[PDB]
Amino acid sequence: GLFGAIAGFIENGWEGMVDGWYGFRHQNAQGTGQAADYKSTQAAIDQITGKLNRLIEKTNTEFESIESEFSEIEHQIGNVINWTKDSITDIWTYQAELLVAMENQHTIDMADSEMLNLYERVRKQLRQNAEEDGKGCFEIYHACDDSCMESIRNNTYDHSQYREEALLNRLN
Amino acid sequence: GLFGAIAGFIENGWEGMVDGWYGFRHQNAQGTGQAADYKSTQAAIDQITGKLNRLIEKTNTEFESIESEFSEIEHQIGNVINWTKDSITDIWTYQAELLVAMENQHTIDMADSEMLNLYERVRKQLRQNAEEDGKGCFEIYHACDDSCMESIRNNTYDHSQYREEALLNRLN
Amino acid sequence: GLFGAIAGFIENGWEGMVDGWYGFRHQNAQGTGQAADYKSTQAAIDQITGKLNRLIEKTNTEFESIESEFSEIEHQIGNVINWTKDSITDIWTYQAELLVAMENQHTIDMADSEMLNLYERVRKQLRQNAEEDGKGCFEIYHACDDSCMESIRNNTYDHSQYREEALLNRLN
Amino acid sequence: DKICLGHHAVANGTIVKTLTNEQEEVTNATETVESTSLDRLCMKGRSHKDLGNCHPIGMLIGTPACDLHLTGTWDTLIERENAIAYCYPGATVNEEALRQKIMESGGISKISTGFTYGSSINSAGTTKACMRNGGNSFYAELKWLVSKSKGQNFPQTTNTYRNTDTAEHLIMWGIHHPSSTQEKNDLYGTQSLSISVGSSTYQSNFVPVVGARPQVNGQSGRIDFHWTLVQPGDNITFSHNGGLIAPSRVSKLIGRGLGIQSDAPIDNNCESKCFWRGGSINTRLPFQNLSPRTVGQCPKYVNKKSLMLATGMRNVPE
Amino acid sequence: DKICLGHHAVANGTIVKTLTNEQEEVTNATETVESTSLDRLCMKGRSHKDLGNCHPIGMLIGTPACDLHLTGTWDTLIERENAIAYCYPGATVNEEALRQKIMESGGISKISTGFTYGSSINSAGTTKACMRNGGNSFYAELKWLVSKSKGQNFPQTTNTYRNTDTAEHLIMWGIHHPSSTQEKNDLYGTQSLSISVGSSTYQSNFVPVVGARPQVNGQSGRIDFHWTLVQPGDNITFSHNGGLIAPSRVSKLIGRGLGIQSDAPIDNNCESKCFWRGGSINTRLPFQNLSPRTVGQCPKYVNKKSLMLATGMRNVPE
Amino acid sequence: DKICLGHHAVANGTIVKTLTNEQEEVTNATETVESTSLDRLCMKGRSHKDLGNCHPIGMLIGTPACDLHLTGTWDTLIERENAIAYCYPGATVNEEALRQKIMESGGISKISTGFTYGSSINSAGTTKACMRNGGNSFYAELKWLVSKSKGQNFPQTTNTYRNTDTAEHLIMWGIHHPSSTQEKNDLYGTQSLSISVGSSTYQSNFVPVVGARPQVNGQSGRIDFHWTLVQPGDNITFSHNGGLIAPSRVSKLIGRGLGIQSDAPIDNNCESKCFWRGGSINTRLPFQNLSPRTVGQCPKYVNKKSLMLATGMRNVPE
Numbered sequence A, B, C: 001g002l003f004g005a006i007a008g009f010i011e012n013g014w015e016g017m018v019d020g021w022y023g024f025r026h027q028n029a030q031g032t033g034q035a036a037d038y039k040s041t042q043a044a045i046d047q048i049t050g051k052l053n054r055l056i057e058k059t060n061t062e063f064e065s066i067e068s069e070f071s072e073i074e075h076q077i078g079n080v081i082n083w084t085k086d087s088i089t090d091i092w093t094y095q096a097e098l099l100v101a102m103e104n105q106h107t108i109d110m111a112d113s114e115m116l117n118l119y120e121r122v123r124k125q126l127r128q129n130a131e132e133d134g135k136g137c138f139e140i141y142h143a144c145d146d147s148c149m150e151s152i153r154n155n156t157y158d159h160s161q162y163r164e165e166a167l168l169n170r171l172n
Numbered sequence D, E, F: 001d002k003i004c005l006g007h008h009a010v011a012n013g014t015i016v017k018t019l020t021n022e023q024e025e026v027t028n029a030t031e032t033v034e035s036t037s038l039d040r041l042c043m044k045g046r047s048h049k050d051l052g053n054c055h056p057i058g059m060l061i062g063t064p065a066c067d068l069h070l071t072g073t074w075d076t077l078i079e080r081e082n083a084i085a086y087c088y089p090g091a092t093v094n095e096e097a098l099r100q101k102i103m104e105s106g107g108i109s110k111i112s113t114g115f116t117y118g119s120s121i122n123s124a125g126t127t128k129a130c131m132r133n134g135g136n137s138f139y140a141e142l143k144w145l146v147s148k149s150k151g152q153n154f155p156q157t158t159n160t161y162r163n164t165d166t167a168e169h170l171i172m173w174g175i176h177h178p179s180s181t182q183e184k185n186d187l188y189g190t191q192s193l194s195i196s197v198g199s200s201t202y203q204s205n206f207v208p209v210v211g212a213r214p215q216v217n218g219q220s221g222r223i224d225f226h227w228t229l230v231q232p233g234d235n236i237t238f239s240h241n242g243g244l245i246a247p248s249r250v251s252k253l254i255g256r257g258l259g260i261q262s263d264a265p266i267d268n269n270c271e272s273k274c275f276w277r278g279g280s281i282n283t284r285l286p287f288q289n290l291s292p293r294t295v296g297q298c299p300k301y302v303n304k305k306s307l308m309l310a311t312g313m314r315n316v317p318e
């Protein structure tokens, strides 16, 4: 996409991810893992909610019938009204298709950005202890246990602990 | 601009590339060669086609005569039609001006990122076998010939084969 | 936001910085100071001044009186005028709100772009001489005097001058 | 020894239209154009007045079917199809300009004209078209004035209505158009007839049209109606030698109400702000594809059936 | 041992307008506003009728010019400037409403009323204003009624048209207005004159007025026209003692078409969906700068000469 | 050994609306809707003509208040509240349509008609309503036509105006309606009354109305004005037998003007290009919320009190 994360370098999303919108799928000596992220999901949710908020904001505009339903109206004004109404319709029909399409484009790319913003948050946190995979993962060059990967997600990970360990593993 | 690839960290574009929109140029021991990536260009080209399909759509909303173009209409009712015809025109002019101004901005920033996406795609292939200059070019630290340059463009690149040779030249 | 710089990986800027929109704060053995960037500051203002001048332009669609402020209007046609004028006001009130929301959403992400682009310029320049902490601050693995910090700001910074020196600190 | 990143995905996605693609598949999306219509007039918390068989103009003249609705107070007035306004053949000069004025009003107050007639005038004119109780009658708010005896010329009579109220009263009167020269002489006489209406803003003369016509309700003769509004402290003077359908009461509109033209049944269980010919529109979203013509606080009409706004990201299947 | 990434560019780029920039250079662009007009009327596939010197109203009454347009069907109607409908000086009441109604039709049909008259009536009264083959004629779908004896009184004749068709019909009749006070006496008689038209929906009386005025086409007199619609099953009755121009045929409008007011050459090799005063507009672009007044499936008129939509990346010079 | 990056922010930030956030704090923002207006007419660089106590329509007929500006040229025209239009009670048919033509024009000229009459006709008829120097006077551009002696009959009069100029002129006439049958025979005669106006481009018949009615300005009789435009080269004829006042000189509307209607002090130090009934609007901003009724070149009216545009970036507290 625009930010090139969703459907970009990451092949696809996870159909098992039910507890959130964005998450992690880690593998180590102990076994597998799957846990979602709050900030990234909530940033996507909070922005859609406020985008839906403008939509349902109803106008207090009172209109009354100028075109009679059952009885007949004068033929010349009857063309004027038919023209004006159809011209107003054309404005609101095209305008609607524009808004829907415009808000559709920005939201998809907005959700794409918060994916990339999380990837960039993990890359900078792992500093020089991990190298980039290419498919959206991170190759950790030190023994990172189940509580170690949690310290990344908790945003408490310190590279100074595994700096000497990972660097030597990268270079043999 | 928004993504700083076109008119950003890259000085200028190459005015000789006819095959595609985005591409790479290599400088090895055998010489220089011109090749444009097919997949990265289509993503941008197809996105423009979708905009051109949106503006050829048939507005079959038919209108008919309300003002006599030969004879004269009554003054009061004719004056209101003028006010209405001008207001709809004044709206549609502002609608046409906004659509163009916005859509263009989006296409500029669309193409700005569509090569940054290619830039990050190649970056992840080479990983630690090349370094960034700032001008928008990757300098390879290993011996990469024409068949090697082929794999980087063709995406059939494997960095495991060239990992050891590169991580010797870098740290010296 | 979109580029995750402002209110993203940079916690916050500086209120004391009045001489620019984007700036540098240096930390070394001599002391601490501040110097603002001019290139990315103007690059953000040029986008804004373009927008600011794009709406203050007044078109000359001259509208003439159709309703009398003192004389009585015919009731049947008065409703036709009222129905159109309320509809027109509703289109313009809608267009005025959508524009403000559109332009404010675009300007807020435009500023995120020039902050990220300034960050991406310095990152590629320092190359191997530095490492990013993730808080929006580059750490060089050598000593920089006031001339060494001014050289990154003037964009004239040679990475090969401190290549082996800073590469030594990184491995011990 | 690796930590991965990625988004969530669903099995069945929702198709949306973008600037670049009209076949985009997001995870989840919602509708913005209403297609649902309640075929009921939602009148909860609303003092509505159904007219059934009466047409709004009948309220001011007194049609037998509109006898129930000659007075009241409302914030909403409901009008139906096939609603009768004229028991006896005829119409009203700019009747639409009058009808929507009644649909904008929020109540009708009736006030007597105080018209006294001479000995030679039979103020009790009736017709088989206007039936009350079972027998023949006339428009409730009006009086047919004919000669007391056949042939005798209708006397030059001057009738004046005067305003005292602070507001403005709407006065109505009719002109009878006879079906033949032989019949014309029976009702008013052989003399040339002229009905002159005078006020301070309105002056107009009427001459009764006499001639053969097709049978409507069982009659060839017709009565057309005329209307004007008199200001406070202003007087309206009539001068006629026959043909005038005199006003016995004047109308006065109280406040402002809502005017609905729908044939749908009424319901007090729901409440609505938006109505059309097929019922009520109850929705929060700003678009609808039901009808171009609506009344009240309403979503704007669009030509498209469905328009989906995306709430989720791109849907990429596994 | 080096690989650089980049993009393509061109020398002379196109300038476009942006949100943030007035002057922006791109590699490619395309127009959205239509400036190019076609000075022809494209009638391919369309079954059309060019009236020429004749006016649409003249088809109903039978003005000499439209002797070839009295009956026929079309899907497009073309009207030309300075058209002719009145050989004899006069005007039709509510003309524009009548005019548009004919233009809002797709064919005209005619059925003879067959009104019969007495021995003292001359129906073949003709004028030298409506010349046909050199000799004097009158509107083909109307007959001028005068007394057979110059000076004597015109009979109190009554005529009624029957509508026995499933669809509605249009009827027209003419009212004479003399130039001298001796014309009524020599053509209709010395007696008082009145014309009563009656139906279930419409009825009116209008007297022929005498007065001196300027001469149009050599003629000092006036013949004005009136029209109404006759509902299926309903009848229309004329009570007249002269001064009336009775119809010899009625008219029934068929289906629908498209009415264009344009002075432009017809092209049968060309096809189009929008038309204006100066011809046709053929395009796929959504906007135009030509005319606000257009008909048919037509793109939206904007008050700007050109607005270009970029179809390539930002052009960077060397 | 460290270099940091950042972005400036203020202590007192302002709030703006976006697509995703209702309340977003920015470093700086400016208003896009004009709320302030000066209650003064800015007339710098404009050759304005202030109407004052007189009405626009009073210029064409000759109201005693329009004596200072029967002719004259301008670019803009200002109308005031409670402006005297008619001294003698009555109204003009299509009053607003006539008013708008004067507000469309940038100057009025007067061209003499040259209407002479017989010995039986008196053109020196005047009224007590139109006060001139504490006497009895009539409209400046019209002359009341009555019979010379009290009780006489008015003769059949034929008057013709000739349009020889290259531009069309505005002819104005009025039909007098007597307050009684005894007044109708007093100065117009016992004869049957009918007034006819006939030309090539316009023709219509008018008949006066009798009957008692309230005294406006101390007068029961009323004059209703009618108007048409005589095309260049054409000739208009008035065929009347009594009850019509004749034009002494017709009006020529030249150029284009501006129609302003407000009651506010005139200021010649300021210059504005848009006005409303409250004052004038001087703004660059594309939107306004003061009044939906404006004239000239204006920003578009909106219902929003405030819409702020982000001049700065995302304000983060530091």
Ligand SMILES: *[C@@H]1O[C@H](CO)[C@@H](O[C@@H]2O[C@H](CO)[C@@H](O[C@@H]3O[C@H](CO[C@H]4O[C@H](CO)[C@@H](O)[C@H](O)[C@@H]4O)[C@@H](O)[C@H](O[C@H]4O[C@H](CO)[C@@H](O)[C@H](O)[C@@H]4O)[C@@H]3O)[C@H](O)[C@H]2NC(C)=O)[C@H](O)[C@H]1NC(C)=O
Residues within 6 Å of the ligand: B075, B078, B079, B082, F104, F255
């Ligand atoms: C609603 O708005 C429309 C336009 O948007 C108006 O329609 C125009 O009406 C004006 C008159 O008000 C017309 O313009 C005038 O035409 C006169 C006759 O010229 C004819 O012939 C020439 C041939 O060269 C044609 O170009 C022209 O179209 C006409 O067919 C002229 O006498 C006038 O000229 C005067 O003004 C011009 C320009 O300001 C100056 O040179 C001089 O001052 C000159 O005296 C003038 O050009 C025009 O025909 C109408 N246009 C259209 C497209 O219909 C309506 O009037 C308006 N409705 C209102 C106000 O009720």
Ligand SMILES: *[C@@H]1O[C@H](CO)[C@@H](O[C@@H]2O[C@H](CO)[C@@H](O[C@@H]3O[C@H](CO[C@H]4O[C@H](CO)[C@@H](O)[C@H](O)[C@@H]4O)[C@@H](O)[C@H](O[C@H]4O[C@H](CO)[C@@H](O)[C@H](O)[C@@H]4O)[C@@H]3O)[C@H](O)[C@H]2NC(C)=O)[C@H](O)[C@H]1NC(C)=O
Residues within 6 Å of the ligand: C075, C078, C079, C082, D104, D254, D255, D256
């Ligand atoms: C098309 O649009 C125009 C403009 O919107 C309408 O014109 C309005 O007409 C209505 C009449 O229905 C006017 O509203 C009435 O105003 C009366 C007095 O107004 C004065 O006081 C106000 C102070 O608020 C001033 O702003 C104003 O300038 C006047 O000096 C009130 O007396 C009326 O109240 C009535 O209703 C209440 C209901 O609570 C009852 O108590 C009484 O029955 C009472 O009579 C009413 O509010 C309005 O002023 C006009 N607009 C303007 C700008 O002046 C047309 O009517 C409209 N056409 C339609 C709808 O067909």
Ligand SMILES: *[C@@H]1O[C@H](CO)[C@@H](O[C@@H]2O[C@H](CO)[C@@H](O[C@@H]3O[C@H](CO[C@H]4O[C@H](CO)[C@@H](O)[C@H](O)[C@@H]4O)[C@@H](O)[C@H](O[C@H]4O[C@H](CO)[C@@H](O)[C@H](O)[C@@H]4O)[C@@H]3O)[C@H](O)[C@H]2NC(C)=O)[C@H](O)[C@H]1NC(C)=O
Residues within 6 Å of the ligand: A075, A078, A079, A082, E167, E254, E255, E256
């Ligand atoms: C302003 O806009 C309105 C709405 O668009 C127009 O009103 C329409 O007028 C047309 C033409 O009279 C109507 O179309 C007719 O529909 C009849 C069917 O009856 C009902 O069915 C429709 C749905 O199909 C319902 O909406 C509605 O309840 C109708 O009452 C047909 O019987 C008619 O066919 C006739 O003509 C054909 C020739 O084309 C003959 O072959 C047939 O024998 C038959 O006589 C016709 O198709 C339409 O129903 C009206 N709509 C509404 C909402 O009133 C106005 O005409 C327009 N004003 C203008 C142009 O001045």
Ligand SMILES: CC(=O)N[C@@H]1[C@@H](O)[C@H](O[C@H]2O[C@H](CO)[C@H](O)[C@H](O[C@]3(C(=O)O)C[C@H](O)[C@@H](NC(C)=O)[C@H]([C@H](O)[C@H](O)CO)O3)[C@H]2O)[C@@H](COS(=O)(=O)O)O[C@H]1O
Residues within 6 Å of the ligand: D125, D126, D127, D128, D129, D136, D146, D177, D178, D179, D187, D219, D220, D221, D222
């Ligand atoms: C067998 C037969 O032909 N029936 C005879 C009838 O012709 C006639 O009564 C009928 O015809 C007359 C006129 O020819 C009336 O229209 C009458 O209907 C009324 C009506 O109800 O509308 C009766 C009213 O009393 C009358 N109103 C008044 C007082 O003016 C109106 C009025 O004439 C019209 O409205 C005017 O346009 O008409 C109808 O029933 C009777 C004789 O009755 S009559 O003396 O009243 O004429 O005889 C039948 O045998």
Ligand SMILES: CC(=O)N[C@@H]1[C@@H](O)[C@H](O[C@H]2O[C@H](CO)[C@H](O)[C@H](O[C@]3(C(=O)O)C[C@H](O)[C@@H](NC(C)=O)[C@H]([C@H](O)[C@H](O)CO)O3)[C@H]2O)[C@@H](COS(=O)(=O)O)O[C@H]1O
Residues within 6 Å of the ligand: E125, E126, E127, E128, E129, E146, E178, E179, E183, E187, E218, E219, E220, E221, E222
């Ligand atoms: C100069 C002079 O004195 N010569 C006399 C002629 O002016 C006059 O004939 C002409 O004048 C009359 C009006 O007096 C008409 O305008 C007449 O034209 C027609 C017309 O074409 O419209 C002729 C028609 O035949 C006639 N239609 C019928 C059948 O009624 C109409 C009609 O009368 C008018 O429209 C009514 O207003 O008029 C034109 O020929 C003749 C008149 O005498 S004659 O008819 O016996 O020949 O006398 C000349 O001396």
Ligand SMILES: CC(=O)N[C@@H]1[C@@H](O)[C@H](O[C@H]2O[C@H](CO)[C@H](O)[C@H](O[C@]3(C(=O)O)C[C@H](O)[C@@H](NC(C)=O)[C@H]([C@H](O)[C@H](O)CO)O3)[C@H]2O)[C@@H](COS(=O)(=O)O)O[C@H]1O
Residues within 6 Å of the ligand: F125, F126, F127, F128, F129, F136, F146, F178, F179, F183, F187, F219, F220, F221, F222
């Ligand atoms: C105390 C009181 O009641 N006042 C008496 C007056 O009513 C009366 O004169 C007044 O009434 C007459 C009609 O009865 C007139 O309206 C008259 O005003 C004028 C006017 O408008 O200026 C006088 C003009 O001379 C006259 N114009 C002409 C030449 O026709 C018009 C004219 O009548 C109407 O405009 C036609 O509709 O009216 C007004 O002053 C006098 C007696 O005067 S009278 O002999 O004229 O009757 O007595 C007062 O005491």
Ligand SMILES: *[C@@H]1O[C@H](CO)[C@@H](O)[C@H](O)[C@H]1NC(C)=O
Residues within 6 Å of the ligand: D162, D200, D233, D234, D235, F214, F215, F216
């Ligand atoms: C109405 O009549 C009264 C007398 O009943 C009178 O005082 C008043 O002036 C008249 N009203 C008008 C507007 O002339």
Ligand SMILES: *[C@@H]1O[C@H](CO)[C@@H](O)[C@H](O)[C@H]1NC(C)=O
Residues within 6 Å of the ligand: D214, D215, D216, E200, E233, E234, E235
């Ligand atoms: C009109 O008269 C005809 C016969 O003359 C008749 O069949 C028809 O019923 C009449 N029309 C109406 C509406 O009664």
Ligand SMILES: *[C@H]1O[C@H](CO)[C@@H](O)[C@H](O)[C@H]1NC(C)=O
Residues within 6 Å of the ligand: C154
């Ligand atoms: C740094 O020096 C260069 C000259 O090479 C000049 O362009 C630039 O403006 C200088 N920057 C400052 C902050 O003085």
Ligand SMILES: *[C@H]1O[C@H](CO)[C@@H](O)[C@H](O)[C@H]1NC(C)=O
Residues within 6 Å of the ligand: D028, D029, D030, D031, D311
């Ligand atoms: C999909 O579910 C989400 C969350 O419950 C909601 O926002 C959205 O409206 C749903 N879509 C539909 C069509 O109900």
Ligand SMILES: *[C@H]1O[C@H](CO)[C@@H](O)[C@H](O)[C@H]1NC(C)=O
Residues within 6 Å of the ligand: E028, E029, E030, E311
């Ligand atoms: C732009 O120009 C190119 C030629 O390089 C052509 O292929 C293309 O059709 C053009 N596109 C538009 C939209 O004009």
Ligand SMILES: *[C@H]1O[C@H](CO)[C@@H](O)[C@H](O)[C@H]1NC(C)=O
Residues within 6 Å of the ligand: F028, F029, F030, F311
């Ligand atoms: C904010 O300050 C800047 C710089 O002085 C200026 O451009 C802008 O107009 C100011 N806005 C407000 C509302 O003070």
Ligand SMILES: *[C@H]1O[C@H](CO)[C@@H](O)[C@H](O)[C@H]1NC(C)=O
Residues within 6 Å of the ligand: E214, E215, E216, F200, F233, F234, F235
């Ligand atoms: C106006 O009337 C007279 C007729 O004698 C003449 O000068 C002129 O031809 C007439 N004008 C027109 C347009 O017929």
